C-alpha cells in the first residue's frame, strides 16, 4: 500500500505516540535519511510541528518529537536546524508548558526541561556543528 509509496508521516506518528517506549533510533535513523528527500522532509516537519503543538494528556507527543527534532537536527539534512531556527518560537513556547496528570505528577517538568535545552542548542552554531560530528559517527 503501495508502489513504494512515502511512509514519512506515519513513521514520524510512530516516533511520537504516546507510548511510554521509544522512539526508536532505528527509527530516527530512518527519519534522518528522509530529512534529504526534499518530499519527505516537508511531510516529516509538518508532522513535528503538530506534534510539538499537542497539549494535556498527549504531552509524550511533545516530549518524544522533541527528542526526535533534536535527532534530525543532529544527524539529518542541514535544512533541519534551518527550518528550527525559523520556527524557534515553536520550541520556545514550551519552556511554558504545563501537565499535571491525574496522579497529581508533574509532567510537564519534563517537556520544559527539554524545551529549554533544544533552545539552548539550536541558538549556538558551534555546539550545532560539534554534536553533529559526534551525532554522525553515532549513525554509522
Same mark, same amino acid.
Given at each position: 500500500?503501495?508502489?513504494?509509496?512515502? $511512509?514519512?508521516?506515519?513513521?514520524?506518528? *510512530?516516533?511520537?505516540?504516546?507510548?511510554?517506549?521509544?522512539?526508536?533510533?532505528?527509527?530516527?535513523? $530512518?527519519?534522518? &535519511?528522509?530529512?534529504?528527500?526534499?518530499?519527505? !522532509?516537508? /511531510?516529516?516537519?509538518?508532522?513535528?510541528?503538530?506534534?510539538?503543538? &499537542?497539549?494535556? @494528556?498527549?504531552?509524550?507527543?511533545?516530549?518524544?518529537?522533541?527528542?526526535?527534532?533534536?535527532?534530525?537536527?543532529?544527524?539529518?539534512? *542541514?535544512?533541519?536546524?534551518? %527550518?528550527?531556527? *525559523?520556527?524557534?518560537?515553536?520550541? %520556545?513556547?514550551?519552556?511554558? !508548558? %504545563?501537565?499535571?496528570?491525574?496522579?497529581? +505528577?508533574?509532567?510537564?517538568?519534563?517537556?520544559? *526541561? +527539554?524545551?529549554? %535545552?533544544?533552545?539552548?542548542?539550536? @541558538?549556538? /552554531? /558551534?555546539?550545532?556543528?560539534? $554534536?553533529?560530528?559526534?551525532?554522525?559517527?553515532?549513525? $554509522?
Amino acid at each position: 500500500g503501495a508502489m513504494g509509496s512515502s $511512509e514519512a508521516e506515519i513513521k514520524v506518528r *510512530e516516533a511520537t505516540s504516546n507510548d511510554p517506549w521509544g522512539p526508536s533510533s532505528s527509527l530516527m535513523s $530512518e527519519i534522518a &535519511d528522509l530529512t534529504y528527500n526534499v518530499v519527505a !522532509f516537508s /511531510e516529516i516537519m509538518s508532522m513535528v510541528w503538530k506534534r510539538l503543538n &499537542d497539549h494535556g @494528556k498527549n504531552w509524550r507527543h511533545v516530549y518524544k518529537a522533541m527528542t526526535l527534532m533534536e535527532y534530525l537536527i543532529k544527524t539529518g539534512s *542541514e535544512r533541519v536546524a534551518q %527550518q528550527c531556527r *525559523e520556527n524557534i518560537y515553536a520550541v %520556545q513556547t514550551l519552556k511554558d !508548558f %504545563q501537565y499535571i496528570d491525574r496522579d497529581g +505528577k508533574d509532567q510537564g517538568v519534563n517537556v520544559r *526541561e +527539554k524545551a529549554k %535545552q533544544l533552545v539552548t542548542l539550536l @541558538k549556538d /552554531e /558551534e555546539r550545532l556543528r560539534e $554534536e553533529r560530528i559526534h551525532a554522525l559517527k553515532t549513525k $554509522e
